[PDB]
Amino acid sequence: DYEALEIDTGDKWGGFTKDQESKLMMYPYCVTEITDFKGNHMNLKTEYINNSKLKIQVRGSLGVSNKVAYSVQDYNADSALSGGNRLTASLDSSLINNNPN
Amino acid sequence: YGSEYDIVSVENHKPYDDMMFLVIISKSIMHGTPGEEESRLNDINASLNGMPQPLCYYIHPFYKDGKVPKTYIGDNNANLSPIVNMLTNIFSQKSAVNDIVNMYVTDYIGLKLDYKNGDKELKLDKDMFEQAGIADDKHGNVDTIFVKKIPDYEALEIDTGDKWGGFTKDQESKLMMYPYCVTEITDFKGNHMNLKTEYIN
Amino acid sequence: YGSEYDIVSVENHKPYDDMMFLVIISKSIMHGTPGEEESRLNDINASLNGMPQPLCYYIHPFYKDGKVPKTYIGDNNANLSPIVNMLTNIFSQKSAVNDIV
Amino acid sequence: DIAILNDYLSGGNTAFDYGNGYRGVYVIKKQLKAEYRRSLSSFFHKYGYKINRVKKPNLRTRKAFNYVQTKDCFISGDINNNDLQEIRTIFDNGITLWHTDNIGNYSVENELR
Amino acid sequence: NGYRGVYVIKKQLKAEYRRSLSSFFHKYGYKINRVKKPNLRTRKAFNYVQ
């Protein structure tokens, strides 16, 4: 079986300048982008990451060519949604790199 | 109603649950079968498989740990090879491999099957399938399934239950309607569609 | 809220930090292993790798300066070749190269 | 497809999908965020739904109150026409009919009668 | 050139617009669009209500 590896990047609000007006922390005023700088990228509305931290799950394989996926399973997850269901549902909105390398 | 949805329910359904099929296609017959009086090796064999068609089809059910279900064809145990050993042996047989034109895996072969997922037991119609022994007397024997014919395909129904199950029920029922709620169906392989739940009749 | 964003934070995360893998796929067994009872060279060898599959997979961890990690398999040091030398040597061996897909 | 080990050998990643457990079909249910649920639910609670039908109005169908807003409504009666015109104007402008003595308390459920 | 793995890039609006919007919110609060009882005395110095 293949398995997911979790990368904990820490406090999801880390790095943003904190305004007196908290609404300026919301999309569209701020945004978190995830990219591989190889053509794959996605914008995350930080407020909708259901977790205090931004954690990224890495999935991959050892098949006939390179393929690695980067997910944020907590993005748009209902609070009651299990970790397993979150990981499952996150693939349609993941960074997927299938560069042959 | 905002810019994003919460994902509130996630469920997976597979046609044969834990079982998948390996499909092997060859230009001619590769196998012997118990009781046959004469060899059919290398014979062309056209058959009804969805439509009249000229290739030979072999199938092999398997599980992710490499085990295979106990499979009967009529009253006889087909004695299926474990799938990994079978791949090794089939590709080791020069005669077998030179005749094979495709190999793929599929979740559904166009038939409702007499299959017990819990017991890992499969029963197949002897009029449609037969035991296939593929051997060259040097490498390991392969025991698999030859498809004699599948005249028609059929639909298999998956019942997921109450279509409103999983949504939070608001005091205001209109908030159960699209665009406030939506049911998405996807294979997570690039195919997906949004359903307005209220319009599922 | 304007037409452009300021980039305020940039961070890079890699699954195995400094390490990546070279993956070599061949149609048959190219190697011997200490203790093996009989040679398996040129044998077909299917295996579970994500799914049941018929090819032979070799992997080689490496760093950007050409070093490789000290690697143990169980209790035994695998004595890995440095990656540059390995590329030179693997492609110098015709038996090896003709089987690599 | 799975690789065929013949003399011709040397696409797509079947292993990634199967090995990470993706098979069959998935049902994903999605709903609007809590912020917007609160907004919209409170609005519908007070003002009902958009209807866009020509019909007799729902005047007394809920337990506590009914909101009614018409356009070009038809109202007749043995009433001087000045007052009838004023009454039609009232409903065309929108009015809440209270069926309880606790007028103005919107915290109640207001379930169907 | 050193590109491996995944990158997290955080982005925010320019100072010109931060000044604009924060001064506006400071005076007039936020758009609410909710049916509810009004916030009359929830801040230390003043409450805008519309």
Swiss-Prot record, chain D:
User: Which region of the full protein is contained in this chain?
Assistant: 405 to 599 of 599
Q: Which gene encodes it?
A: 9
Q: What does this protein do?
A: Distal (knob) tail protein that plugs the end of the tube before DNA ejection and forms a channel perforating the host membrane during ejection.
Subunit relationships: Homohexamer; forms a hexameric tube structure with six flexible hydrophobic loops.
This protein is called: Tail knob protein gp9
Q: Where in the cell is it found?
A: Virion
